[PDB]
Ligand binder design. Structure first.
Ligand SMILES: *CC(=O)N1[C@@H]2CC[C@H]1CN(c1nc(OC[C@@]34CCCN3C[C@H](F)C4)nc3c(F)c(-c4cc(O)cc5ccc(F)c(C#C)c45)ncc13)C2
Ligand SMILES: Nc1nc2c(ncn2[C@@H]2O[C@H](COP(=O)(O)OP(=O)(O)O)[C@@H](O)[C@H]2O)c(=O)[nH]1
Ligand SMILES: [Mg+2]
Length: 169
């Protein structure tokens, strides 16, 4: 069975854990332990292919040990998540993309830009801003809500499709 290693990265509080738990459990958590970094497996069918998705939901101290470099280097594609009500989390996307490029030693790593919390009314990052950023990176952009499940399947499945396109060479 085909396995895909997905990694969810981004600032604290953008909804990485809520997105992961929505995908895996079809339920919205109002709180998820900020001390829990972990990987979950989910079997799905994407475009007729039965896959195993291994989803690493990242958390912990900001540290750049060689061990953590190798841990991140195992990821085959990355969801780079910001929240559309938090401009700082959007400005931090550059950082996460650069760190992925660094550990993967490539400018062509499967990535999807995810603007989460799209159910909230207090939007500070406009859609055009995010699509412009994603266009400049050459990656898809998807708006999601872990609360309503809007866009959640599409974000993770689009990442899988990006990994397949990379694997085809
Ligand atoms: C509370 C919590 O769980 N986290 C916080 C944000 C994400 C997690 C882990 N921590 C963390 N933070 C940052 O950047 C935080 C900012 C804001 C304040 C100072 N910095 C720099 C920017 F301004 C943002 N980055 C990381 C981080 F890069 C990694 C990590 C580490 C290594 O060695 C490789 C690597 C490769 C690819 C990656 F995507 C990431 C990531 C993420 C990598 N680990 C934790 C980070 C604080
Ligand atoms: N309204 C709304 N709240 C969300 C959404 N995603 C996450 N949250 C909330 O934002 C807070 C932080 O989410 P969390 O998953 O812990 O973010 P993480 O730090 O990136 O893992 C929690 O209270 C979640 O309930 C969303 O799409 N909409
Ligand atoms: Mg979390």
């Amino acid at each position: 069975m085909t396995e895909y290693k997905l990694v969810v990265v981004g600032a604290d509080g953008v909804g990485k854990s809520a997105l992961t738990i929505q995908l895996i459990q079809n339920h919205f958590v109002d709180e998820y332990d900020p001390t829990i970094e972990d990987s979950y497996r989910k079997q799905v069918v994407i475009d007729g292919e039965t896959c195993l998705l291994d989803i690493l939901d990242t958390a912990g101290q900001e540290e750049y040990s060689a061990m953590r470099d190798q841990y991140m280097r195992t990821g085959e594609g990355f969801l780079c998540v910001f929240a559309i009500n938090n401009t700082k989390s959007f400005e931090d996307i550059h950082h996460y993309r650069e760190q992925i490029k660094r550990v993967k030693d490539s400018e062509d790593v499967p990535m999807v830009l995810v603007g989460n919390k799209c159910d909230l009314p207090s939007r500070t990052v406009d859609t055009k801003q995010a699509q412009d950023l994603a266009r400049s990176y050459g990656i898809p952009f998807i708006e999601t809500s872990a609360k309503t499940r809007q866009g959640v399947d599409d974000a993770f499945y689009t990442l899988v499709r990006e990994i397949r396109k990379h694997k085809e060479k």
